Nucleic acid binder design. Sequence first.
RNA 1: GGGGGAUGACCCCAGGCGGUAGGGGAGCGUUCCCGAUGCCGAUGAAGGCCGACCCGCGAGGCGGCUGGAGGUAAGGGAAGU
RNA 2: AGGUGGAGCCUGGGAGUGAGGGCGCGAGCGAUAACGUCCGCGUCCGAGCGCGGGAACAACCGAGACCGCCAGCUAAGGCCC
RNA 3: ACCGUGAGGGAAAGGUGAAAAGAACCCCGGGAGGGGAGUGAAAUAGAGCCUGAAACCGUGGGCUUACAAGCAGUCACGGCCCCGCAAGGGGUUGUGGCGUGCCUAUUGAAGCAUGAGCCGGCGACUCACGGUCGUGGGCGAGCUUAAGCCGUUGAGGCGGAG
Lengths: 100, 117, 108, 189
Amino acid sequence: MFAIIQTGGKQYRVSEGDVIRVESLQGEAGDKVELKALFVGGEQTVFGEDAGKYTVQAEVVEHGRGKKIYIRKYKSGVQYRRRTGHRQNFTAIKILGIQG
Amino acid sequence: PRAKTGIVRRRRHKKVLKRAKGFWGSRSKQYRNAFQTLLNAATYEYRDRRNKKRDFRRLWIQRINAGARLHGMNYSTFINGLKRANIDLNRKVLADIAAREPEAFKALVDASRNARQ
Amino acid sequence: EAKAIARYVRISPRKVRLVVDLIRGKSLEEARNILRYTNKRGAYFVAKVLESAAANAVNNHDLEDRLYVKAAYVDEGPALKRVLPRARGRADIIKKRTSHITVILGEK
Amino acid sequence: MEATIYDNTDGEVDLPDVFETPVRSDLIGKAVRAAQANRKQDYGSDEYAGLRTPAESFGSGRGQAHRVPQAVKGRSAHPPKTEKDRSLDLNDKERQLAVRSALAATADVVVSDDFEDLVKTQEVVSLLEALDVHADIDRLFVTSDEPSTAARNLAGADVATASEVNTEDLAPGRLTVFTESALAEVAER
RNA sequence: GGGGGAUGACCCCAGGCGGUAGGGGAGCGUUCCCGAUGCCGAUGAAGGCCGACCCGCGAGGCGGCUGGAGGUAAGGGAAGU
RNA sequence: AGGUGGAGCCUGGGAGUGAGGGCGCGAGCGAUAACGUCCGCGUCCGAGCGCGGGAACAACCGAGACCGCCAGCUAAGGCCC
RNA sequence: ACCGUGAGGGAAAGGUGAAAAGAACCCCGGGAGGGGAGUGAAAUAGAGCCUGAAACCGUGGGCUUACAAGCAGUCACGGCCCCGCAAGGGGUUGUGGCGUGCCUAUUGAAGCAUGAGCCGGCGACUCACGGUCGUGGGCGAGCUUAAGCCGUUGAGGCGGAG
């Protein structure tokens, strides 16, 4: 149940535990949706093969939710008379690891 | 046209204060260096803000070595061989593997060594 | 359990402090000889605030002896802002830091 | 247009190009404005005190630093300067103009002269039940030359005159009536 | 800036974006005057005390405890902010 | 001519500093002496031209800091600890 | 009040409650002050007794502390402790990892240059008449003094020297 493909960014090493995933506001909207995610890390049941052997099949996961920035603050300061403050961003829509 | 600013400033401070965990003996409530200490901490975090992601670039660096060598070689070998790759290129996760799934790792470890020599 | 106390108490909060910090959490009767035969002032006092303590209870807070002092403390407040020799020009006052005196008396 | 005539079942009067027209919010308020204005009051903080006493701001080379402001209750810094020119004389044209278009806004309500006669603030409870609602809520008295007697008193007073009864007047949100002689102010218009 | 914007907004890419005196634009709370066919509150005015929803933000909202009586303005105005 | 692309010109309101140094080079002085000063050509810093390097070191080599902690190639500079 | 021989200076300090019903009596105690009862909607509303924040002194508890450096700290990983926004976070830190405070004036500043011990409240680009550009808008000949009259609200409207 544990695979490791890679999206518009590695963000990988999963199977089912839906992994908070980088944005993608074009296919996402698709609530609990289905979509393909190229592989390149075939690790299943103690059997592996090139991430280049893979680059042929893959998987897919249901477009779950839209995590809302998990808090995180950025005190932008310095002795040099320069301050300011902006809170987290990076969310993301969640989605389970549809393995195959 | 009275301005008893009052109630207001006080608040603000509270503000920061919060910004005021329970850090070091004092500032603790240091309605100053209180405030200060802040500014500091801040920017800090910042630079830390971007920092980390580095501290990582390395972390894996070793945990990596831990293996990359294990078998018998370094990360200027591997690497080179790796990029000999073609439909498979990654590094991060690689590590946290070699340790997670020995076989898996072990694997590539080969396909690698080879790619190379 | 019950308790004794008294503010507007002229004395070295501090000093006081040692006071209990001894007889502290301990058998009634027992310390009741600590302060009876200890030393430094406060004692006297300290003692006092143990009797209307032991009292109050049994009397209106009730089981004798089996008692003691689950806890005891003192606080400062009201000061006594005191004027002294004008820097031979400007005033220099100290402060007999008033003194509170609470102290528990609960039963074993 | 829909120059509705009171007495209701009776006649209807015409809408005078004047009122008709469009609107001009800007001036709108403005009219307003040049209202409260010339109509507020004034104030300030002591001339004597705030610059009242002697002062020995103290030598120096001692441990200090220095009858002026910045140590308590005293001074000010630029306060109520009663000498605070309050007026604001809008401008004629300006004004008038307002009321106008202003009123225009009013149109969006016809007081038969014949009323310039009714003689009791309970004859209002009447010509009342005639046509009430919420706009009446507003209301807004006014006869034509010499006010609508008793009509002037109640729980909505205010009796302009075919002359004297501008925006300050009702202009505000509001809703009211004018005795012909009233539209004698229109002439003023 | 530019390709159509329905009021939003959406798409491309060009295109940067470190900045003190200092120049231009935009917003935030503070005590007051409207009550532009505005009024909440003894089952709390407000200040206080504490917080892992809303905002780039300066603030908001909102819920728990406190406390004895107020005052809030959906919008424009004013200033001892 | 112009590949460029985004500086240019006039009218007009609001300004700030009106005394700087550091480095390379070409000159002046100077014991071709000084982290000396004095003029020039480019850069440099400007209390943030914040980060990398050279141990540490504005500053000299590379670099232009909108924001994204567990991506990828390199610069200068390095890879026995 | 208070310092000044004098002329003169010249402060601080208001708030219980609906009303006293303002705490008879009993308790330890020389008392003050503390324990009960009683008023009471509440007395942690209780006699300088409304709200009564901070600084600062206490009393217990969680975590933490004796081969260890820096105000800071913030990034990583770990154990104990609680999960009224539970498979995610709270708090505390053992290590290690990268780190020179903060303000004015400065060519240049960690600073060993100065500014400040700590907290709370006051405390610093304003108003008027002119002039000056820009803009929101009313007529292009545009526009009003002072005053006369009208004025719960008090309603502006006439005034034509300039």
